Amino acid sequence: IDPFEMAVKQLERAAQYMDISEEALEWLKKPMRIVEVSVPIEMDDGSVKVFTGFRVQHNWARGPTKGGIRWHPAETLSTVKALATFMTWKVAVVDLPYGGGKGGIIVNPKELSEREQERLARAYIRAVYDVIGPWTDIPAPDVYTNPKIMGWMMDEYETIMRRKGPAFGVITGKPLSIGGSLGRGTATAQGAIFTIREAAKALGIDLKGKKIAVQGYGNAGYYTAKLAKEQLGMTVVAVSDSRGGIYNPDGLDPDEVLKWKREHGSVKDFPGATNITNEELLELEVDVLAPAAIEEVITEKNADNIKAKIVAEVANGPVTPEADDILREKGILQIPDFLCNAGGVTVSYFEWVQNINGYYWTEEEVREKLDKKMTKAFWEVYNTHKDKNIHMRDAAYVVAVSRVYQAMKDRGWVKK
């Protein structure tokens, strides 16, 4: 259905830039395994309600499938299939020994007590136990799941598995007490910062004293603005959320803006700044624009008005295929979403490695390994885009799909 058909189209469009057999392309267009389950819980009032849960394993040629669990009332199988498909490319572009998976439950978690949320987390694991495992499929947090829910899920898994293996390794995003990793909270923003540092090096830009704008001020947007200021020495001139943006050409302090948003609900009306719309933030003259909120914010309509030299796609799919052509015609370097935001899954890979090896790393070890991986992935994608004269997004597919295809050939799944 529609998110899934867009994911398949993005794959069909990039496949024109590589030699891939029709048999391999057809395999890559179909998730290998899809599970739809009844997830029953007892409510606080004693009534039993059955929720709909999904787990999708797109492709495990390179290793166990990896990806998060979304709890959302709008949740469809189409969306979970799309995002499992994207996870296959994301883990492959950063060269992880994984495949792509994704899960979800059709629920409004704001209507569930803590007790009901725990009963749902546990019931989900009991419904999908036979297709998950530390060497099979490793979930993680996503929309309206978090380390608290991951702790309950791990606990339930370990109970059913009878402590026979590295049960901590069944799921990532765990609390530190029970096999979590250092660097989880900043992983997505921190990896995007490394990709932005490398894009600047490729363009011959010193980011010290240059300007960034960040669309969105959830965890990812906040940490993107904080880390760009603290690590790259940038000036954060604009941030935004769903209620509007703020602008100050001499810089915002990201911690002070976050404090403001916690007191009043939005960055809007932050003292010393001008209120601006989301559209004006996207059109600002900055060295880096980081769309870190919602999909399809840069499209055919506004692509011509973007002035950023680097668009760091922190959110999933914030730039449409028609906008890709325009930004590239203007000489603007995009960091495609599944490269730019791959820090999240990379640190979750490090967590899993810590779990199956029974040995935990320091914050500095996690950070240097994340840096090497994101730096090497950026250079493979940029070098491919230069050598083949293609859009960065097509280069990202070429790097990723090549690895998945090669694994499928070396297993004999496809004969060519």
Q: Can residue 160 be called a binding residue for a copy of itself (CB under 8 A)?
A: yes
**Would you say 84 or 196 has its CB closer to a copy of itself?**
84
Residues facing 245 on adjacent strands: 240, 276
Antiparallel, parallel or unpaired: β 235-241 and 137-138:
unpaired
Which of a copy of itself, Na ion, none interacts with 205 (beta carbon under 5 to 8 A by kind)? none
Applying CB under 8 A, among 70, 174, 229, 385 the residue interacting with a copy of itself is: 174
Phi, psi for 209 (deg, rounded to 5): 80, 0
**Would you say 290 or 408 has its CB closer to Na ion?**
290
Left if phi > 0, otherwise alpha if psi is -120 to 50, otherwise beta: which for 67? left
Q: Can residue 73 be called a binding residue for a copy of itself (CB under 8 A)?
A: no
CA-based nearest residue to 351, from 366, 371, 367 = 366
**410 SS3 class:** helix
**Would you say 219 or 375 has its CB closer to Na ion?**
219
Sheet strand arrangement including 274-276? 274-276, 244-247, 235-241, 211-215, 288-291, 310-312, 333-335
- Separation of CA 398 from chain center: 19
Q: Is 219 annotated as a binding residue?
A: yes
Q: Is 68 annotated as a binding residue?
A: no
**Would you say 220 or 390 has its CB closer to Na ion?**
220
CB of 386 to a copy of itself, least distance (A): 23
Stretch touching a copy of itself by CB under 8 A, among 1-9, 103-111, 349-357, 379-387: 349-357
**253 SS3 class:** coil
Q: Is 221 annotated as a binding residue?
A: yes
CB of 103 to Na ion, least distance (A): 20
Q: What is the DSSP string of 80-126?
A: HHHHHHHHHHHHHHTT-S-EEEEEEEE--GGGS-HHHHHHHHHHHHH
Report the C-alpha gap between 243 and 271 in whole angstroms: 16
The answer to whether 105 and 32 have CB atoms below 8 angstroms apart is: no
Q: Can residue 78 be called a binding residue for a copy of itself (CB under 8 A)?
A: no
Q: Can residue 5 be called a binding residue for a copy of itself (CB under 8 A)?
A: no
Applying CB under 8 A, among 83, 154, 189, 396 the residue interacting with a copy of itself is: 154
Which of a copy of itself, Na ion, none interacts with 223 (beta carbon under 5 to 8 A by kind)? Na ion
Which of a copy of itself, Na ion, none interacts with 199 (beta carbon under 5 to 8 A by kind)? none
Which of a copy of itself, Na ion, none interacts with 110 (beta carbon under 5 to 8 A by kind)? none
The answer to whether 363 and 354 have CB atoms below 8 angstroms apart is: no
Q: Is 216 annotated as a binding residue?
A: yes
**Would you say 284 or 314 has its CB closer to Na ion?**
314
Applying CB under 8 A, among 280, 360, 365, 375 the residue interacting with a copy of itself is: 360
Q: Is 302 annotated as a binding residue?
A: no
The residues annotated as belonging to the active site are 102
CA distances from 123 to 48, 56, 146, 156, 162 (A): 12, 17, 17, 9, 17
Q: At what angle do helices 77-93 and 392-411 cross, to 10 degrees?
A: 90
CA-based nearest residue to 393, from 11, 6, 100, 95 = 11
**272 SS3 class:** coil
Q: Going residue by residue from 314 to 343, which x/- string records binding to a copy of itself, judged by CB under 8 A? A: ------------------------------
Stretch touching a copy of itself by CB under 8 A, among 164-172, 192-200, 225-233, 248-256: 164-172
**Where in 124-143 is the site for a copy of itself (CB under 8 A)?**
126-127, 129-131, 133, 135-136
Q: Can residue 60 be called a binding residue for a copy of itself (CB under 8 A)?
A: yes
CB of 9 to a copy of itself, least distance (A): 19
Give me the half-sphere count of Cα atoms (radius 13 Å) on the Cβ side of residue 197.
Answer: 20
Number of other residues whose CB lies within 10 A of the CB of residue 416: 8
Q: Can residue 163 be called a binding residue for a copy of itself (CB under 8 A)?
A: yes
The residue ranges that bind Na ion (CB under 5 A) are 186, 188-189, 220, 223
CB of 37 to a copy of itself, least distance (A): 5
CB of 189 to Na ion, least distance (A): 4
Report the C-alpha gap between 269 and 247 in whole angstroms: 10
The answer to whether 278 and 212 have CB atoms below 8 angstroms apart is: no
Applying CB under 8 A, among 89, 168, 223, 382 the residue interacting with a copy of itself is: 168
**Would you say 262 or 359 has its CB closer to a copy of itself?**
359
Query: Can you say which residues are annotated as belonging to the binding site?
Result: 216-222
Query: Can you say which residues are annotated as belonging to the binding site for NAD(+)?
Result: 216-222
